[PDB]
Amino acid sequence: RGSQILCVGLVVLDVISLVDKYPKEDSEIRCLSQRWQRGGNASNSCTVLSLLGAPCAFMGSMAPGHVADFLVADFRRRGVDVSQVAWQSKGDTPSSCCIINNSNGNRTIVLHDTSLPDVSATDFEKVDLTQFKWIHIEGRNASEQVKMLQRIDAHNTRQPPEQKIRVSVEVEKPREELFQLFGYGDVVFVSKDVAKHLGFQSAEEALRGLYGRVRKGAVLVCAWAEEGADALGPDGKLLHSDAFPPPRVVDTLGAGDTFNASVIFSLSQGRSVQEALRFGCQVAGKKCGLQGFDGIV
Amino acid sequence: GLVPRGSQILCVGLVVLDVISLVDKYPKEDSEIRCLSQRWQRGGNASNSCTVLSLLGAPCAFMGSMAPGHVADFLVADFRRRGVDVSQVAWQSKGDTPSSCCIINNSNGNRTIVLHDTSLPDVSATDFEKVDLTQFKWIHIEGRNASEQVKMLQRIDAHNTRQPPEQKIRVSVEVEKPREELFQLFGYGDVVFVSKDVAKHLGFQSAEEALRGLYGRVRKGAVLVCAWAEEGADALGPDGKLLHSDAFPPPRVVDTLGAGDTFNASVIFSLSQGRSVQEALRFGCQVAGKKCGLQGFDGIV
Ligand SMILES: Cc1ccccc1Nc1nc(N2CCNCC2)nc2c(NCC3CC3)ncnc12
Ligand SMILES: Cc1ccccc1Nc1nc(N2CCNCC2)nc2c(NCC3CC3)ncnc12
């Protein structure tokens, strides 16, 4: 069957305040405007995949309430298949305050991480893999997710190399539990932040450094903000793309997630890595000159 | 439902959703962090006063602007959680329901605040024209859009004219922000609360200075009231006698957000039960002092 891309990670309620300068501690400013957004990484990518025309599904934990009710209404307005959601009985829907600096698009996030339990190999074991051509996993609970990945590798072995499910991993946080995911998946996304918190000061360094850790045959991608992004495949040849900066950067909240969704969409449509990188930077760049996600397509 | 004539106390003003985050350290711009804890709270001066009026046992209503949406839903259910009648809300078709973001540093205590946008339209005098006043024994107004609020106050004067002294609606006004627009509001109301912040911005350095210095601006026969945190609160009436009450410090101070509103509501309450101004200053101070030792409004009983 396999027409859908699945993203596994967080859905968070983003309570957003657009200010024109980042307030100095102990001071007080008035925001230009405010809004609510369905956020969290896997969730954001689903938004982006949807907008690009790719049928997709989200999978993460949500706790029933008025909050979950809004997040789902939004998922459904987008056409994001939520049927894979691991509903919880104990815990709250995470949320966060996001101050977005309108003069330069900087975004500052205060996350309220609830009790809410992550999805587990248990919940995942319960999933119909034959619906998906691509599966992307937001690194969080490594122990449990590695399990999930193996269930997919093991599912690929019993498949025509034609009908194999493509797998991508994001390692966005500098915490060590996650460095095992490097690891699995055809495509591995590592953030500038991780890369720096590990000694590296350029996208090309990070890639020469970390290529050691990836499933043989994998592509490692590392974006570097206004500097574009680089990728490195089995052949050893470094690939680069210049960023596409909008003329006014006004909102970079979910720029990384836009990059990733875009890279995945492109690879999932047959494109070269070079083309998918370029496209990643192109949509990310365009989103930086917009409030939210509407208007990138 | 049916509200018995002359039974409710109405507070007009702001309701806002405050999202309050406690953090290890103040986050550097463009960073992502995890707060120690986060809380969603209904706030705003007329808003907090209602909560307290309800907890004190007074039927009370809130009048302010909201826009349909999920923030309004949370604020409305919070009002209801506190027994506040929201049937007088002025629902708006344009703008955001006010939402403030508030960041508290756990390792030095400072508060950083992103204030709600200014997009939602205040309640106008023409909205106020539409309200049947007979349900109210007292109307309290948090000064915001004074040009318009003056009209509302003039309407209440009109109404009181055709009424026996025992169906006249008492009126209180609150000037809490140092803005020229607001000062005309001194001229209206039987009771006028001026905040410590306003008094200082005008150069006064105590409750006594402020009361002595501003009483000139209130209408004949009005009482002017100035609370001053740990120094207690003063009041000055037509008879020229300055009245005072000391503060009642709690065993330990925990949460002073909304203490000014707790005081306001408590004085209003006491006056409305027929108590003397002196008895009501005291009570205002007792209640606001108890509230200072408590998280939120819960245990103020
Ligand atoms: C290419 C990419 C990958 C992953 C995340 C974001 C991006 N793109 C950009 N991120 C940021 N970031 C996110 C990281 N913090 C800084 C802003 N800034 C820009 C930018 N800024 C305008 C430059 C001043 C000319 N122009 C184009 N693309 C991006
Ligand atoms: C009486 C009153 C009217 C209006 C607003 C507040 C109050 N009461 C108090 N405010 C503050 N404020 C609120 C404003 N920031 C400073 C503390 N501190 C205290 C306090 N502290 C105990 C220490 C012995 C003095 N004890 C009793 N009442 C109040």
DSSP string, B212-278: HHHGGGSPTT-EEEEE-GGG-EEEE-TT--EEEE-----SS----TTHHHHHHHHHHHHHHTT--HH
Among B280, B276, B1, B4, which residue's Cα sits nearest to residue B136? Answer: B4
Pair of tokens at residue B4: 């018995």
Q: Are B270 and B283 in contact (CB under 8 A)?
A: yes
Task: Name the CA radius of gyration of chain B, rounded.
Answer: 19
Q: Which of A29, A31, A140, A173 to mutate to test the interface with B (most CBs of B within 10 A)?
A: A31
CA angle B121, B126, B131 (to 5 degrees): 105
Distance CA(A199)–CA(A19), nearest Å, equals 33
| Cβ–Cβ < 8 Å for B112, B22 | no
Instruction: Tell me the C-alpha distance between A139 and A119, whole Å.
Output: 12
Amino acid type, B22:
L
CA dist B178 and B199 (Å) reads 8
Type of residue found at A64: P
Residue B62 DSSP code: E
Residue A10 neighbours by CB under 8 Å, 6+ apart: A40, A41, A42, A43, A60, A94, A138, A140
Distance CA B274, CA B272 (A): 5
B187 is in an annotated binding site: no
Enumerate residues lining ligand 1, CB below 6 A: A 223, 225-226, 228-229, 243-245, 249, 252, 255-256, 259, 281, 284-285, 288; B 30
Residues of A in contact with B113 (CB under 8 A): 23, 27-29
Question: Hey, are the CB atoms on B19 and A22 less than 8 Å from each other?
Answer: no
Contact B16, B120 (CB under 8 A): no
From the alpha carbon of B285, which atom of ligand 2 is closest? Answer: 1
Q: For residues B188 and B150, is the Cβ–Cβ distance under 8 A?
A: yes
Burial of B68 (0-12, 13-18, 19+ CB in 10 A): exposed
User: Inter-chain contact A110–B37, Cβ cutoff 8 Å?
Assistant: no
* Rounded Cα distance, B296 and B299, in Å: 8
Residues near ligand 2 with C-beta < 6 Å?
B 227, 229-230, 232-233, 247-249, 253, 256, 259-260, 263, 285, 288-289, 292
Nearest to B141 by CA among B130, B132, B150, B129: B150
Most B-contacting residue of A14, A28, A34 (CB-CB within 10 A), to test interface? A34
Query: Three-state secondary structure along chain A?
Result: CCCEEEEECCCEEEEEEEECCCCCCCCEEECCEEEEEEECHHHHHHHHHHHHCCCEEEECEECCCHHHHHHHHHHHHHCCECCCCEECCCCCCCEEEEEEECCCCCEEEEEECCCCCCCCHHHHCCCCHHHEEEEEEECCCHHHHHHHHHHHHHHHHCCCCCCCCEEEEEECCCCHHHHHCCCCCCEEEECHHHHHCCCCCCHHHHHHHHHHHCCCCCEEEEECHHHCEEEECCCCCEEEECCCCCCCCCCCCCHHHHHHHHHHHHHCCCCCHHHHHHHHHHHHHHHCCCCCCCCCC
Say whether domain B1-301 belongs to CATH 3.30.70.260: no
Closest CA to A62 of A98, A97, A91: A91
Q: How far apart are CA A51 and CA B33, in angstroms?
A: 29
With beta carbons less than 8 A apart as the criterion, state whether B267 and B225 touch. yes
Cα→Cα distances A271→A282, B217, B248, Å: 15, 76, 73
Q: What are phi and psi of A197, to 5 degrees?
A: -60, 20
* Gap from B40 CA to chain A (nearest CA, Å): 11
Distance B247 CA to ligand 2 centre (A): 7
B233, B24 contact by CB (below 8 A): no
Q: Do B114 and A27 touch (CB under 8 A)?
A: no
- What are the tokens at A65? 């309430």
Position B176, amino acid: E
Task: Report the alpha-carbon distance of residue A28 to residue A12 in Å, rounded.
Answer: 26
Closest CA to A231 of A271, A199, A269, A198: A271
Q: Which two tokens stand for residue B61?
A: 């209503």
**Residues on chain B touching A112 (C-beta within 8 angstroms):** 21, 34-35, 37-38
Taken in order A205, A209, A213, A216, the sign of the CA dihedral is positive
Contact criterion met (CB below 8 Å) for A230 and A240: yes
* Chain A: residues touching B (Cβ < 8 Å): 15, 17, 19, 22-36, 66, 70, 95, 97, 99, 101, 106-113
The angstrom resolution of this structure is 2.5
* Distance to chain B for A114, nearest Cα, Å: 9
Query: Encoding tokens for residue B97?
Result: 């329901």
Closest CA to B286 of B261, B257, B269, B262: B262
Residue A147 burial by Cβ neighbours in a 10 Å radius (0-12, 13-18, 19+): middle
CA–CA distance, A133 with A3 (Å, rounded to integer): 6
Distance B211 CA to ligand 2 centre (A): 19
SS3 B106: coil
Answer whether B122's CB lies under 8 Å from B144's CB. Answer: yes
- The rounded distance, in Å, linking the Cα atoms of A36 and A74 is 11
- What span, in angstroms and rounded, lies between the C-alpha atoms of A148 and B79? 45
Are residues B47 and B80 in contact, defined by beta-carbon separation less than 8 angstroms? Answer: no
The ligand minimizing its distance to the Cα of B260 is: 2
Q: How was this structure determined?
A: X-ray
How far is Cα B132 from Cα A219, in angstroms, rounded to an integer?
A: 71
How far is the C-alpha of A102 from the C-alpha of B196, rounded, in Å?
34
What number of C-beta contacts closer than 8 Å exist between A and B? 93
Cα-based distances in Å from B97 to A36, B10, B67, B72, B100: 12, 20, 5, 6, 10
- The number of angstroms, rounded, from the C-alpha of B86 to the middle of its chain's C-alpha atoms is 16
Q: Is B284 left (phi over 0), alpha (psi -120 to 50) or beta?
A: alpha
In this structure, what DSSP letter does residue B135 have?
G
Q: Are A134 and A166 contacting, i.e. CB atoms less than 8 angstroms apart?
A: yes
Q: What is the spatial distance between Cα A65 and Cα A13, in angstroms, rounded to a whole number? A: 12
Q: Residue A26 and residue A7: Cα distance in Å, rounded?
A: 39
Residue B27 to residue A107, Cβ atoms within 8 A: no
Residue B240 assigned ligand-binding role: no
The answer to whether B112 contacts A36, with C-beta atoms less than 8 Å apart, is no
CB within 8 Å of A128: residues ≥ 6 apart: none
Q: What's the DSSP call for residue B85?
A: B
CATH class of A1-297: alpha beta
Q: Which two tokens stand for residue B250?
A: 């709690």
Helices (H) and strands (E) in chain B, counts: 8, 15
Backbone gaps in chain B, preceding residues (C–N over 2.5 A): none
